């Protein structure tokens, strides 16, 4: 998933766009 995310500041704020994907899944799991 993060390999196509690089196309659409590198590995600092860009890497902080990867983390919402594990956050959204985590919310569904715990709820």
């Amino acid at each position: 998933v993060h390999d196509p995310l690089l196309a659409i500041t590198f590995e600092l704020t860009l890497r902080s766009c990867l983390y919402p994907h594990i956050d959204k899944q985590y919310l569904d799991c715990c709820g």
Binding site: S16, Y19, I22, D23, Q25, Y26, C29, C30
Partner: peptide
């Protein structure tokens, strides 16, 4: 023995893994 790279999302890592296993136990 550890890095701090994964720190800003680590809580939601651990708290998802263990809770998913507690789903799997049902």
């Amino acid at each position: 023995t550890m890095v701090s790279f994964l720190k800003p999302v680590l809580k939601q890592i651990i708290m998802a893994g263990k809770s998913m296993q507690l789903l799997k136990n049902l």
